[PDB]
Amino acid sequence: AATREFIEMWRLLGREVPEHITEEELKTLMECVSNTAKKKYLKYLYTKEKVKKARQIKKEMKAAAREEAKNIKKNFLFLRLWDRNMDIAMGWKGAQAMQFGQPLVFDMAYENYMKRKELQNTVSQLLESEGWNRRNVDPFHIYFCNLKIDGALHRELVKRYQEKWDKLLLTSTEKSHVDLFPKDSIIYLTADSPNVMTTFRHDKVYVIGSFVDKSMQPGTSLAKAKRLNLATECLPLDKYLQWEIGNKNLTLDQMIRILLCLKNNGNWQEALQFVPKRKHTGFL
Amino acid sequence: SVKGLVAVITGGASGLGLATAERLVGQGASAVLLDLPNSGGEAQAKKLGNNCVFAPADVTSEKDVQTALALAKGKFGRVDVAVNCAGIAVASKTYNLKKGQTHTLEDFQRVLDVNLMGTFNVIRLVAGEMGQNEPDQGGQRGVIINTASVAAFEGQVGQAAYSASKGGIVGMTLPIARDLAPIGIRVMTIAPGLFGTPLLTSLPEKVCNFLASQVPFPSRLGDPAEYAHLVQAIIENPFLNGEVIRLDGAIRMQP
Amino acid sequence: SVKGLVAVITGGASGLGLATAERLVGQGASAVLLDLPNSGGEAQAKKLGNNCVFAPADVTSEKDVQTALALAKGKFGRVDVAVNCAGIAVASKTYNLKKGQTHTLEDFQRVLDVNLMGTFNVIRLVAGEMGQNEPDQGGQRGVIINTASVAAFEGQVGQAAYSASKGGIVGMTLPIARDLAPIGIRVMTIAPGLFGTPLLTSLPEKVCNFLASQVPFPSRLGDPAEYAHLVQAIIENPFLNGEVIRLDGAIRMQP
Amino acid sequence: SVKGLVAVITGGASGLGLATAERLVGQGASAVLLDLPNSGGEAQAKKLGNNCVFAPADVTSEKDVQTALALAKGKFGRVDVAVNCAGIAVASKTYNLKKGQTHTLEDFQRVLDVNLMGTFNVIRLVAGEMGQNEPDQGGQRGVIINTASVAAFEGQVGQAAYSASKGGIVGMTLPIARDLAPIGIRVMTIAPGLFGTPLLTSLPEKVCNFLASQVPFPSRLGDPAEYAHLVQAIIENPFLNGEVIRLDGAIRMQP
Amino acid sequence: SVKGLVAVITGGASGLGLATAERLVGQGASAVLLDLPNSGGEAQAKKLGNNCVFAPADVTSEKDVQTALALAKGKFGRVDVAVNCAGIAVASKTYNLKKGQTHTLEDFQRVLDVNLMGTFNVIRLVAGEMGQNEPDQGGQRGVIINTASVAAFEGQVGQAAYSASKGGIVGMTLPIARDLAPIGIRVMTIAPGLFGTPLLTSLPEKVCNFLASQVPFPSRLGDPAEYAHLVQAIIENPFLNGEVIRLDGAIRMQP
RNA sequence: UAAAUAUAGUUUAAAAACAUCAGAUUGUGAAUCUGACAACAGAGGCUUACGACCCCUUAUUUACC
Ligand SMILES: *O[C@H]1[C@@H](O)[C@H](n2cnc3c(=O)[nH]c(N)nc32)O[C@@H]1COP(=O)(O)OP(=O)(O)OP(=O)(O)O
Ligand SMILES: C[S@@+](CC[C@H](N)C(=O)[O-])C[C@H]1O[C@@H](n2cnc3c(N)ncnc32)[C@H](O)[C@@H]1O
């Protein structure tokens, strides 16, 4: 193809192009309509290899050091099988969560407003968001709504979870949140909501849009929450925090962590700790 | 052997009761399904053959059970084995501080009538029918098998109502065995764990998969046929009386 | 210590409940006697002093318990301990072939409502009252103590109904303890054996003396004051939860 | 079914072990008697025919058990079932103040060595033999059955040493079941009480007749054949694991 | 009350035994530490005051215990309470298929010698000295408290040796109580869960946090002082005999 | 409207550290092993390249006499 040599010459120009690239990555570069998009995408691949090789050089160093130390070189109550034990313990809590835990909904209706770069990141935060829920004392009953089976988000989640996807203790479905819970008990959280949330109510269902807008798209969730007559709310960031830098749209992992602390009787002092410190110059 | 024996299986139109009826009928015994009119037991009775009949009755009602027992006497002439399998469950916490929800007393009462009171109603009425039987070479007049649950020993969160009823069956197993010992009626209790029954199917499919995987061995939901096999073993063994047998694959249920 | 604690003792007008109230009140705690109007608990509350009050209520009815708990809230402001001592017993064989007598369903229901349903009714309602209490330095909001019986393990002949109700309490002791663990309420069960309660002492000396001699050690009927001592130990010990304590002097019942 | 299965029945020369061998061999299975050289088990093995072999070994010693397992491997090629029935009993009080007699530590150690330590020695050694078995359609590599006693729960005077050894088997049945669950081996325990074995029959005739009448039903000593039937049921049932089954006729021993 | 009583605390140099000594000595009682010579028992006895003495002895050896008990008689003149807290913990899988490792018989034997055999050695020897005491107003000569564990009920993977030894204590607790009931000695057993003993606290704080969260309520490792409180309650309660009490916060150990 | 700023797990400094996901029956350094994901607001340009340089959008914080 004409694109293959297109890259090789860029290698002669030293356009920060990686050494080895799979054909799968080549067609992704094909989709790039602009040279700057190709320039940006290639740099991402280049740093991808740089971290891996630096990772590997520092990795074989670990093996070499450990084996050398070994060459130079009772009564127990429990066997060292802790990692397995915690996984089972979290599973039991997770099973209880889906029978009695408060429903937390992740809305997956934003797939049309996401590029591939942001769609990948959304799954990364979704993995972390669910990870923190599992380790929590009182996990939420996480709901994955509007998750099309053939959609990109569903396919990406399967690859990152592999066989664990079918064993996760969460409800994943194609039906909208309005079809699962009463419309009067649903609060669509969003930074653009004119209403400021003061108290975490345990009888309400909170909807978090699984949307990562690196290219800012204000009001996307508000329009969704206004097309259907659903209440909206926003965190009291300005009320308590001296915001100075950055955007007020927090990450999904931070969002669920903030809600998790609030649901555990924590006050705004503890709950808002998870907001990045670089964004605010103190608390009050 | 169970050849020629007449079994009155409570809640035998589905779940464990139906599995017990299938095995006993296939082994030459005669079964009497005793379930609700809407349980669809009539179709099951026809499928199992002429050795099985359907008795529409409610366990919680003394009159209904008496009619079912009378039907069993007319068709077969005697009652030899009684299996209590009908039961209901509710998943509700005793009290939810966060939601301010308190367990409904009716919900607790409803589970008690069917699981616990219903079991006693069949035990006391069926024991009267077994009294008419003449003692065999071993001096036995009949066998009564109750269906407790592992919740009676360690129950999950929200299983207080179900656990209380099943706890009563375990507690009253030996006293009834002592009560009916002079008349030679054996009372045994089976405490199945996670089985492929409609009671546990109502849970989310992902919950069922995790709970099944937590069984040490075999790592799967209990087959209702396995429960029927244990029921036959209890019937055949004359020295099994006043004991609770846990058929759960060595699984202890965490909260 | 139990100094300043508020305890709601069901069936506190006499028997074990009264003994627990006497010890707790004498130790600085405040007790709320919750018994039937005819139990004469008003006089007992007056005897125990201004720190004890009488709240007439029927445990089997939600309305009566709620009013009684409201009285405790108004008089003392909070509820810290809930001792479930209310209960009655029935003696009747499951089936008497010689006399052709069948255990009527009325008594079995009657004991279940008082011993089993009544205990759960108080547990769920009082747990709401303890929910309002602020967690203490140990994170505990309240303690619930249930009164099972040794018959829940090895009941005697004619105690099938009594064993079933007490067996249920043993069954739901842990599920409720797991249910209320996040709230911070400890649920404990005491399984007393033969105690010198008015009901037991009413029997003729021919049987009462024989039962007293059947206890390995001490070879005498359990003193209700000793039951109160165990209740105080459970209240003071923060690590006692989800367990059934047998206070019977190592005596196992014969048929 | 048990046809084709190879069973290593510890203590199979007489008593419960022999009865298990008789049924399993008669059902098509192969048995390997494992008792002391002077137990006369070779005569019993000859009676049961070619399918049965006698392996003289001492359970308390690792070397002899290994040779016995090797004999089973050579004769039949595999081991599918392990039944532990070897054991001894000592009737000595902990301390008699009237006679000034103190229980000897040698008697206690001897009972533990054979009943408890010997049982674990067979389990750990026989488990390795079953570890080589290819998993069957159900993923099971073998089954282990232990022989606890009712004394583990309701022990009599002078049975402290016997209760301690049998209590360990009941305590350790579930940990081993969890231990061998990944391998695919089921571990079960049977707690027979007052069976017609030579040990019980050795006691005074006046006493044994009295005990035979204390069983609620059947009012007779447990038939060793009945114990064998329960062993077969456990083997056939895939879901019986990590549980203790009381085969005693609903008898709770008294002081 | 415990004022004036002489207590022989086995394994009282650290862990639960030490915590028991502090409370009893602080309440006016006299304690006799019975631990191995290598332990820092001498330092602890001096710190506890003139009411505490250290007797270096090995529980598994009769002679060592006899001298230690004779030391208590010389210093104090009588023995009234005995607490069996000495023990060892060994974790080892019964058989590992992938690793090909089989549980060592020596590991199993040594755990039994200290936890089970050692406990019985003290019980049968102290009863001799408690037999010399004059019965009090209640006819009681002494109190013996044993230290079982939750592993005796549901032991984890690799706890077969520990569970078997603790299971024996739970199994033989009632037989000993029946043996010593005529003498007037009460035998009780405690089964603590996860306690903050030096053995448990030595684990990484990451592991300790997970273990703390495993307890439903309170979600923390058991305080050794809490164990001492139950010991005092058992001593002060004349009607507690032949019963096993789980001081584990309603926790059920998972595999 | 204008001027400085913007790290999509979080910080540091101008690539790392601590975290995240999958697998692990771990003999108590698992304090590890084999993988997954590595985009300094976004888009479009310039240049042999540059995180430089240059326009445009959104967002944040100040000022607007
Ligand atoms: O362009 C600004 C600006 O001229 C003026 N304006 C609004 N807020 C301020 C302020 O705080 N300080 C100053 N010095 N000037 C301010 O109004 C305009 C607002 O722009 P908008 O795009 O929001 O207004 P509109 O919807 O009418 O569209 P447009 O045609 O002006 O772009
Ligand atoms: C990072 S935001 C991005 C989407 C953003 N709401 C938009 O329309 O462009 C992703 C999700 O996190 C939640 N969220 C982010 N910041 C929030 C805030 N400050 N208050 C409440 N919710 C917030 C929103 O519900 C949103 O669905």
Numbering used by the authors:
A (entry chain F): 92 to 164, 175 to 385
B (entry chain A), C (entry chain B), D (entry chain D), E (entry chain C): 7 to 261
Show sentences the authors wrote.
Here, we present several cryo-EM structures of the mitochondrial RNase Z complex (ELAC2/SDR5C1/TRMT10C) bound to different maturation states of mitochondrial tRNAHis, showing the molecular basis for tRNA-substrate selection and catalysis. The human long form of RNase Z, ELAC2, has two alternative start codons to produce a nuclear and a mitochondrially targeted form. TRMT10C is a purine N1-methyltransferase that acts at position 9 of mt-tRNAs using S-adenosylmethionine (SAM) as a co-substrate. SDR5C1 is a moonlighting homotetrameric short-chain dehydrogenase/reductase.
The reconstituted catalytically active RNase Z was incubated to complete turnover and used to determine a cryo-EM structure of the ternary product complex of human RNase Z to an overall resolution of 2.9 Å. In our product complex RNase Z-HS, the discriminator base C73 is positioned in the active site, with its ribose-O3 in the expected position directly after catalysis. Furthermore, the C73 backbone phosphate is wedged between S490, S768, and K700, whereas R728 in the conserved 724-HFSQRY-729 motif clamps the C72 and C73 backbone phosphates. In the mitochondrial RNase Z complex, ELAC2 binds to the mt-tRNA T loop and the TRMT10C N-terminal domain through the exosite. The exosite establishes electrostatic interactions with the T loop backbone U55 via K279 and N253. The ELAC2 C-terminal α-helix (α25), which is only present in long-form homologs, contributes further to mitochondrial RNase Z complex formation. The C-terminal helix contains R788, which interacts with the backbone of U69, located close to the tip of the acceptor stem. The C-terminal α helix sterically hinders a 5′-extension of the mt-tRNA and, therefore, provides the structural basis for the 5′-to-3′ processing order observed in vivo and in vitro. In addition, ELAC2 residues R381, K495, and K731 interact with the 5′-α-phosphate of the mt-tRNAHis.
